[PDB]
Write a protein that binds this ligand. Structure first.
Ligand code: NAP
Ligand code: I6J
Length: 169
């Protein structure tokens, strides 16, 4: 792999935060808050196109969306769903037109985008959140993904967390 992104290519990355159980979402929200993760998510995605599921757009408070500094693209199959300030498309093929795209959730769209992704950036939060029915979950990465696992760090909010970076060809 290479860190340089040619402008004629179409690099797709996924970025998410999970509990150690793999839970990423419950009841339309993220069931923790971690300021180091919010800063990390902004550092990675700023200046790029972000692609999200309709349900992830819904989870953003109206006053904050579309997320600033980034082209917001929302995936929906509903012909009458609209996202003020952002573009709604009906497929991943229509959304992945930029040279660098970060898929920012949620559970459904991660699984949808994984076959095209070459990078994942993960935050793992050491919170004991067991999986319940209806939870959004992080995608599982098969053996074609090579990962770098950071050591455990400690949040100002009192949770342990660590970062992973995965790549593949
Ligand atoms: N921890 C994190 O990193 C993180 C990040 C983001 C979100 N989240 C959480 O994850 C949850 C949401 O995830 P989710 O899996 O329920 O939903 P989602 O992936 O965010 O969005 C699902 C919606 O995307 C649309 N969609 C899915 N597949 C499609 C396809 N093939 N073509 C076109 N549109 C398609 C559909 O919208 P329509 O129904 O309108 O057709 C579907 O209902 C929330 O709890 C949110 O807080 C967590
Ligand atoms: C941040 C959670 C997250 N973390 C990783 N690692 N990946 C993701 N895809 C991810 O979800 C992004 C979509 C949900 O957004 C939010 C959820 C709760 C609070 C604030 C934001 C706004 C956001 C912004 O305004 O940029 C950020 F700064 F915090």
């Amino acid at each position: 792999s290479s860190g340089l992104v040619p402008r004629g290519s179409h690099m797709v990355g996924l970025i998410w935060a999970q509990a150690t159980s793999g839970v990423i979402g419950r009841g339309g929200d993220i069931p923790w808050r971690l300021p180091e993760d919010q800063a990390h998510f902004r550092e990675i995605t700023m200046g790029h196109t972000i692609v999200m599921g309709r349900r992830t757009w819904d989870s953003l408070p109206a006053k904050v969306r579309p997320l600033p500094g980034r082209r917001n693209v929302v995936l929906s199959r509903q012909a009458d769903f609209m996202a003020s300030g952002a573009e709604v498309v009906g497929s991943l093929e229509e959304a992945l037109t930029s040279p660098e795209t970060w898929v920012i959730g949620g559970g459904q769209v991660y699984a949808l985008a994984l076959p095209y992704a070459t990078r994942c950036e993960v935050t793992e939060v050491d919170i004991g959140l067991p999986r319940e029915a209806g939870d959004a979950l992080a995608p599982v990465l098969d053996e074609t993904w090579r990962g770098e696992t950071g050591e455990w760090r400690f949040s100002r909010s009192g949770l342990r967390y660590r970062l992973y970076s995965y790549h593949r060809s």
